[PDB]
Enzyme design. Sequence first.
Site, PDB file in Angstrom:
ATOM      1  N   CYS A 195       5.618   2.180   0.625  1.00 60.44           N
ATOM      2  CA  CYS A 195       5.542   3.284   1.522  1.00 60.44           C
ATOM      3  C   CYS A 195       4.587   4.355   0.983  1.00 60.44           C
ATOM      4  CB  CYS A 195       6.925   3.841   1.894  1.00 60.44           C
ATOM      5  SG  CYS A 195       6.828   5.112   3.281  1.00 60.44           S
ATOM      6  N   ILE A 196       3.847   4.951   1.934  1.00 57.23           N
ATOM      7  CA  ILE A 196       2.701   5.841   1.642  1.00 57.23           C
ATOM      8  C   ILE A 196       2.841   7.179   2.373  1.00 57.23           C
ATOM      9  CG2 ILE A 196       0.806   5.288   3.451  1.00 57.23           C
ATOM     10  CD1 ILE A 196      -1.049   5.013   1.391  1.00 57.23           C
TER      11      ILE A 196
END
Lengths: 301, 301, 301, 301
Positions: free
Chosen positions: B175-176
Amino acid sequence: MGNVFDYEDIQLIPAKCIVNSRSECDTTVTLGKHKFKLPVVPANMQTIIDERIATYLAENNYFYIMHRFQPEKRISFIRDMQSRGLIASISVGVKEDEYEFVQQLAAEHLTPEYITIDIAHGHSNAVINMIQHIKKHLPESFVIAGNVGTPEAVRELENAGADATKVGIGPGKVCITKIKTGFGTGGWQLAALRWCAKAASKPIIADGGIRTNGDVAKSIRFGATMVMIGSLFAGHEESPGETIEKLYKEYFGSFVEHKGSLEDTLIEMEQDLQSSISYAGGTKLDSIRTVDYVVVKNSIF
Amino acid sequence: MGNVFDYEDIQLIPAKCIVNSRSECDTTVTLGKHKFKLPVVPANMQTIIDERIATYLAENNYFYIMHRFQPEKRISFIRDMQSRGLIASISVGVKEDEYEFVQQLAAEHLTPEYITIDIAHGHSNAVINMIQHIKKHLPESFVIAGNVGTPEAVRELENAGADATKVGIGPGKVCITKIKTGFGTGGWQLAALRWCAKAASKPIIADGGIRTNGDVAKSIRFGATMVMIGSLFAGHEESPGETIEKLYKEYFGSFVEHKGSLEDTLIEMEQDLQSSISYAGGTKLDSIRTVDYVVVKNSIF
Amino acid sequence: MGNVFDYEDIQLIPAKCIVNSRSECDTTVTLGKHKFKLPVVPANMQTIIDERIATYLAENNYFYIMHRFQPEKRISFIRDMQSRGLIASISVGVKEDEYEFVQQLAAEHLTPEYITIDIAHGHSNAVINMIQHIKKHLPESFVIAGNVGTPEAVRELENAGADATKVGIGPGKVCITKIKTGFGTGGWQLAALRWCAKAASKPIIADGGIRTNGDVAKSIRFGATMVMIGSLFAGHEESPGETIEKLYKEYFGSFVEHKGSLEDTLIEMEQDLQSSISYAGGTKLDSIRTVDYVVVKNSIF
Amino acid sequence: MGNVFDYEDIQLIPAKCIVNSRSECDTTVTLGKHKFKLPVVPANMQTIIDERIATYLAENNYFYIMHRFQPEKRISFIRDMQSRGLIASISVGVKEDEYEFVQQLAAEHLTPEYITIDIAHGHSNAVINMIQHIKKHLPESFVIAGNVGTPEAVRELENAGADATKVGIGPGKVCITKIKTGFGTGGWQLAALRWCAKAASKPIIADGGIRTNGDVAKSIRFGATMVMIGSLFAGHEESPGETIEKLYKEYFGSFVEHKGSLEDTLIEMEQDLQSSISYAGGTKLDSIRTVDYVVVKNSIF
Ligand SMILES: Nc1nc2c(ncn2[C@@H]2O[C@@H](COP(=O)(O)O)[C@@H](O)[C@H]2O)c(=O)[nH]1
Ligand SMILES: Nc1nc2c(ncn2[C@@H]2O[C@@H](COP(=O)(O)O)[C@@H](O)[C@H]2O)c(=O)[nH]1
Ligand SMILES: Nc1nc2c(ncn2[C@@H]2O[C@@H](COP(=O)(O)O)[C@@H](O)[C@H]2O)c(=O)[nH]1
Ligand SMILES: Nc1nc2c(ncn2[C@@H]2O[C@@H](COP(=O)(O)O)[C@@H](O)[C@H]2O)c(=O)[nH]1
C-alpha cells in the site's frame, strides 16, 4: 518548535470523507492576484525550469518561477510571457547590476507579476534592500523573498515589504549546506516550517525536502501556501540537461533516472492531493490545514 | 494514543508458564455466531484469496473473506458455499449496482453469513448507508465495515450498525496511500489499533502491517479480535497469480518469493500463537490481552 | 525498568585510571564454591560446547556449562571430569526420565558441582519442581535455573532454591522467539537485566545479546555475575560443527565465518575486560559496577 | 549533560547575515602565544602527520601536533623547526625514559612551544605527574594534556597545570575502544564536549568523531578551541602511508580513498567555516558560539 521532526515522521489523521470521488476536490490555490492549479512550483533552478517549461506551466495555470542564470534573457522573457497573456515570474539577486536591472524594467514600463529575490542566506540587509528597491521601482510586482529558516527572518523580510517568503536552508536533495557548515533546516524542514509559519503574515513557500507527493499535503498541514520542488521535478523528458544511454538525466544546483512527461507528474500530484483532501474530510485544499497528526517513532517507512 | 509505536517497537513480557506443551493452548476465536481456528484472516484481495482457498479455509474452520473483484460470481459463490454446509463470507461496496445486489440477495432468499463493506476510506456516509441498507435487507448477515483509522470512525460505523470494523489505513506492504497522500496508520498501525480498540463495542479486525507471526499476538494484546494478513499469505502455492522460473509469485492490490503450502503456514501460525499463549502465562488466546509490554528503543531487530 | 535500552545504547563513563598496565587488573569471579578466570561462559548448546572444550576450559579455570543433547553421556561425563580433579557442570530438563536421572546420580554417589536446569520458558512449576527435586537428591550441587525475563520469575526461582538464575528470553543471534511469538527480552536485553538484577538475591547469568566484548563489561555494570555467549564463541576451530571451503562453520540452537583458536578469543576477552577495569577506575571486576553511563541517541555505531 | 546527542543530531540555526562575501569572515584562533589559520589540527598520529606535513603547516600558520612514534627524532625535530622560525609542537608520554627526555630538553636549552601528553586514558596520576614534571623542567612550553572524557578529568588535569586538555575517548573512525571495553564518548562525542567544556578553564581540543566540515562549526558551538581530525585528513597525497593501484591509502592508529592535496582540503575547511560564520550572523569564529540549535529526530541525513 517545540518538538523537531521532518516529513517522514509525520502521519496525518483522516477525517470523515464527504466526497464520492477525489475528482470533487479542488486543489487550486491563490498567490497574490493569481489562481493556480496546484500548491506546487518547480525549483527556480536551471536544472529544473527553462522558458519551454515556464510557458507550458503558465499556459496551464501552474505557478512557476524562472531561474536567474541568464540574467540578460529576463527582459525579453518578461515581454514574451506578457505579450502572450501569460504571467512573467522571474528571479533577481542583489549583486549588483541587478539594482539597475529592476530600474531598467521601470524605464522599460515592464512590470513582472512575480519577482523572487533568491539568496542562499536570505536573511540579510542585502535582501531587505532589494525588496525596498523593487517595491520602489516596480510596486505592482508580487515579491517573494528568501531563503530563510527562522520566524525572525520571516518577520523582518515581511516587514521589509515581502509579499511572500521562501522557507528552507539546506534541506534540498542536492544541497550540501548542512554538511559543509552545520547550519540550517536540513533534517527538520517540516518542523522549521511549522515554526516559521506560526509567525508569518504573508504566504510562505516551503522550499526543499519534499520526497513524496504526501509531503505536499504535509507542508500544507504545517503552513505552506506553496511548495517548491526540485528533486521530484528533476529528470522529466521536458527537463533541462542531457539524457544518457537505461535512462538518466543530471540534477544539480548553483544521476537521476528518467521520469516521463512533466504533465503526467503534475496530474498525478493533483490526483494524490485530491486523495489527501478526501482523507482530510473536505472538498478543498484548506481542509488539510485542520487535521490531526502523529509523529511516528521509526518512519512512515 | 498516547505514545505512538508500531509492531517492531513492542516486546510482550512473559508470565509464568502454566502448560507442559504449547499443544494445550487454544487459539480459537469466535466472530458472531461462528468459531474459527485462528484469529487470522487472509486479505480479502484477488491476489490473496479465491474460491479454492475460501473452500479450503471454510472446510477447515478458518475464517475467510472473499474479495469483490468479480461481483457477478458472488450469488453463486454464496449458494455453492451454503449448499456445502459452509460459511459464505463476501465483500460489498457502495457503488452503485450493489445496492440492488444486496436487494437481489433478499429476493433470492440468500443470506450470506458475513458481509464486509470494504472501502479504502471507509469513514463515510457512503459506508453508513450500505450498512443500514444491509441491516434492512439481510438482517441476519454479520456486517464488517471499514477501513477506518480512528475511534471516531469506529463509533460512527458501530452506531450505523456494524457488527465489526476493520482497522488500518495504509499500513499494507503493497500500500502506497502513506506515500501519495501523507495520511493514515502506516508507521503506527499497532498504536492506531490500541486506540481504536479502546473505543470499540464491536470486534475489530486489525488490517495490515503484520510482518511476523508474533505481530498476531501483539495485535491480540492491543485489542484485535481478528487479524487480516496480505503479505504473509502472499506467494503460497495455492495463491492466485502466476509463478516464475528460482521461484516467485506476484502480490498487488486494487515480487514475492514462493512460500509453500498455505496449510503449513497456517499450522505454523497456530503453533507460534500457542507459544505466545505459553509465554502469556495462560491456556487460551485471551491470556495475551493481559500481559505487560515494553516499547524498545531500536527495534526487536 | 524504567527506561528501556540495550547493549548498543549504552556508553560507560571512565573514572580516573589507577593502574599502569591493564595487566594489573583482575577479571576473576566466583560462582558458588569456585573461582573462574572470566565472568563469561559459552552457551550450553551443542553448537558451542562439547567435552573437548569443557575439558580445556575446566583445566584452565574457565567456567563452562555442558549442553544436555546426549543425556546418556552425562553420567560418565561427570565421572571423567571428577576423576580428573575437574568441575563437572551439566544441564538437566524436567521431562521426564531426568527425574530419575538426578535420582540415579544420588544412588551413584555422583554429585555434579553445577547443574543448570535450562528451559526456554523457565518461569514454571516445572522448573520449581526440578529445583526442589535436585536440592533433595543432590543438595551439594550448585543449581542454575532458567531461562527467565522478569524480577518476578527470578524471585520465584530463587525462592524455589536456585543458587543462580539465567536471564534472557529470545535475545540470542540465532533465536527467533521474538519473531514467532512477540514475547521476550530481545531488543532490550541489557535493560531486562538491570531490572531482574535489582530483585535478585542470587547470582544472575545474563544470557544472550552479547555482540562485542564491551557488552561483557556492560552486563557487569547492570548486574550480571556471569555472561553466557553463543554467537561470539561460535565458529572457532575447536567449535562443534563442520567447516566449509573461504572458511565457515555452522551455528544453530535447539553461516558463520571461521574465528581462530578459542584460547585467543578468551585471552582477548580477558584483555578487553582488563581495559574495561582500567576505564572503570579500578583494579578488579567489581569496579565496573559503580561507573556512570549514558544512553546514546543513535548507537555506539 | 543533560540530553545526549552527537554531531549528526545537531543543526545550527542561522542568524542574520551581516557580510557580503564569506571572504570577510575570519576563522583564525589563538592557542597560548600563537595565532593559527583554522581551529583544526590533524591527529598527532603517524598515519596522519610527519615532519614534511608539520613543516608545511607551520610555514603556513596552521597548528599541528607531531606524533611520538619515533621519539629519538624529536630533539632534532624541535631544533630544525626552531632554527627555521617555526613552532615546534611535539607529543610525550609518561613511560619512562621520557621523564629524562624532557630533562634532556632542559639541559639542551630546548623549549618546545607545545607539548602534548597524549595517553588513551589520560585521566591518571601518570598524566598529572608528567604535566608537573614539564611545568618544572620546561615552564615555557604550552602543555596539552589528555585524552579525557569527563569534566572531572578536565578539572584535575587543569589543576595539575595543563594549558589545554584534549577531549575524546573512543570516538575515532579507526578507534575500537567503544567495542572492546564498552567505555567512552563514542556515539555522544559532541555532547561529551558540551559537558567537559562547561567545566573547563583552559582551551579544549575536541578530539575525534568529526565526519563533515560542519562538525568543526558544531564543535565550536559546543566549546572547542581546537578540533583534532584524523579521518578527514587521512589519505591525502602528502599523507603518510602507501598508495594502491583506483586509488587508496591506509589509515590506522597505535582502506581509505585518495583525497588530493592537503592544501585543497585546508582551504575548503576554511571556506566552509567562513560560510558557517556567515550563517552564525557574524564576522569571526566566535560568532558560532552563540547560535541556537536543534537536535533533529533522525539525522541531518
Ligand atoms: N544551498 C543550496 N541549495 C540548493 C542548491 N540547489 C538547489 N537548492 C535548493 O533545493 C531545491 C529544491 O529541493 P528538493 O525538492 O530537491 O529537496 C531548490 O528549491 C533550492 O532551495 C544549491 O546548489 N545550494
Ligand atoms: N490503500 C490500499 N490498501 C491495500 C491495497 N491492497 C491491499 N491493501 C491493504 O493491505 C492488505 C494487507 O496488508 P499486509 O498484511 O500486506 O500488510 C489488505 O488487507 C488491505 O487493507 C491497495 O491497493 N491500496
Ligand atoms: N529460544 C531459543 N534460544 C536459543 C536457541 N539457541 C540458543 N539460544 C539462546 O541464545 C544463546 C546465546 O546467545 P548469543 O550470545 O548468540 O546472542 C543461548 O545461550 C540461549 O539462551 C534456540 O534454538 N531457541
Ligand atoms: N583509542 C584509540 N584512539 C585512536 C587510535 N588512533 C587514533 N585514535 C583517536 O582518533 C583520532 C582522530 O579521530 P577521527 O577524526 O578519525 O574520528 C586521534 O585523534 C585519536 O584521538 C587508536 O589506535 N586507539
